[PDB]
Structure formats: C-alpha cells, structure tokens
Amino acid sequence: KVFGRCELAAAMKRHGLDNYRGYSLGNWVCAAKFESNFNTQATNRNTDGSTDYGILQINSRWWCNDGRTPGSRNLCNIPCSALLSSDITASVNCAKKIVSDGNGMNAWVAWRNRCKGTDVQAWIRGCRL
C-alpha cells in the first residue's frame, strides 16, 4: 500500500515513533520517502547480496530472515516478508531496535545524506495530527 505523506505521519505517531530515541516524526517520514516513496511493498537487493525490505528499507543481513542471505542474524526475529505488509507495525517494532544500536538514524544512509540537518518538520507540514 502506498501511504500518502500526512497519512503515514499519522500511522507512525500512534505507533510511537514521534520522538522515539529523540528523533521527531519529520526524520522518520524523510527516511522512507527516499527509501521507498512510501511504498511498503518495496524491496532492493544490495551488493553484499542481502536485500532491503519495507517502507523503511530493512536488510536481511542484520535484521530479518529472507531465507537466502547467508550470515543472517535476524535480530528483529521476523521474516522480511512481514516488512512488506500494509500494516507498518512490524516495520516500526524493528526500526526502534535499529535506532537503538547506538548509531541512531545514521543507520539509514538516506537519512544521513538527505534528512539529517534539513528542515524535516516540513514533512508533516499541513497534516492534522
């Protein structure tokens, strides 16, 4: 399901991502905007061979099991097929973990190269929350 912008912003807010670990809603929206275009059915095979999964783009090397990435850890304890569902509960329950590894949101390169240091509250501008 392709989530709108303010549409998504609301799904996160209630799932508990608005100020999780100290990162506002704006950072989260930006993350998936550049990592999937709000598309939750989005996947992308990485060079290392692992694949990214979800509207937050989460690889199977360190966070989920896809049944084809050798050296998997699956620290989230999931299948990566679950980060494709329209319901972003599992892609949120896992994002928290990743942002609590000690790297913060630096985990997402897209955020370190496109959202970090910019006006990110503009991503929730005009949304009724």
Swiss-Prot record:
It is an enzyme of class 3 (hydrolase). It is found in: Secreted. Substrate binds at D101. Residues 1-129 form the C-type lysozyme domain. CDD domains: LYZ_C. GO terms for biological process: cell wall macromolecule catabolic process; defense response to bacterium; defense response to Gram-negative bacterium; defense response to Gram-positive bacterium; killing of cells of another organism. Coiled coil: none annotated. In the egg white and polymorphonuclear leukocytes. The active site is at E35, D52. It comes from the Eukaryota. GO terms for cellular component: cytoplasm; endoplasmic reticulum; extracellular space. It catalyses: Hydrolysis of (1->4)-beta-linkages between N-acetylmuramic acid and N-acetyl-D-glucosamine residues in a peptidoglycan and between N-acetyl-D-glucosamine residues in chitodextrins. Belongs to the glycosyl hydrolase 22 family. Monomer. This is Lysozyme C. It comes from Gallus gallus.
